[PDB]
């Protein structure tokens, strides 16, 4: 179906995404997911961000954030790298819009197992949890929500 079978997110990394989203209910926010693949399992070890511009319906992360992050990771002894991106959908529910899909296709072209995490901070799933999904474009071009733990 899809290049990544499932996603494992370190709880503090998820917490950082959630807190960043919850700190800006008036605009979409974005950042990068850092981690590594282990077979078909994608591990999200951390989440980082930087300079950006956003509105309720849109966000762009400055491209030099990715550049600086990749170079630091590349230099370091750690075998971690950018594995995806996150952004928020405040009050909009969780999905990939056409623009999001275009961004995500470009991530996957560079790294087949890349993922897009989308969080809506104003909502709670269902027992309760945070309202997020981790998406990937499947081999036949469809948005799929991956199993997350």
């Amino acid at each position: 179906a899809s290049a990544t079978a499932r996603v494992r997110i370190y709880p503090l990394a998820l917490a950082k995404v959630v807190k960043h989203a919850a700190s800006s209910l008036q605009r979409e926010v974005a950042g990068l997911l850092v981690g590594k693949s282990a077979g078909k399992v994608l591990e999200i070890w951390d989440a980082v961000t930087g300079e950006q511009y956003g509105t309720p319906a849109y966000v762009q992360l400055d491209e030099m954030v990715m550049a600086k992050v990749a170079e630091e990771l590349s230099k370091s002894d750690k075998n971690l790298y950018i594995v995806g991106w996150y952004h928020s959908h405040p009050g909009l529910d969780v999905f990939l819009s056409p623009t999001d899909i275009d961004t995500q296709k470009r991530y996957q072209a560079m790294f087949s197992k890349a993922v897009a995490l989308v969080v809506d901070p104003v909502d709670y799933a269902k027992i309760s949890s945070l309202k997020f999904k981790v998406f990937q474009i499947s081999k036949e071009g469809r948005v799929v929500s991956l199993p997350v733990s």
Partner: protein, 90 residues
């Protein structure tokens, strides 16, 4: 000596390109200072099986235009570039 062996040794500047997403091997390309950033990015996109219209090269903290020459940037043997792609939600 094959006539195309000359072409193999054109230049003696080797640069490193780090793909920004994924853990993929950096590319190490032999280039000339007269080469454009665009020619480098084209080669990198071909090696990584990327289309040509989705990435950009960055160098010492700046995103580069494809029309810039490596010579104009003061590129040296061993220097590194990062290949980035956009991060936009919409």
């Amino acid at each position: 000596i094959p006539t195309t062996e000359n072409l193999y040794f054109q230049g003696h500047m080797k640069i490193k390109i780090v793909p920004a997403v994924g853990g993929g091997s950096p590319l190490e390309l032999e280039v000339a200072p007269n080469a454009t950033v665009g020619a480098v990015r084209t080669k990198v996109c071909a090696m990584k099986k990327l289309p040509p219209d989705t990435t950009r090269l960055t160098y010492k903290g700046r995103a580069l235009k494809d029309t810039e020459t490596l010579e104009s940037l003061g590129v040296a043997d061993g220097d590194k570039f990062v290949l980035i792609t956009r991060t936009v939600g919409g």
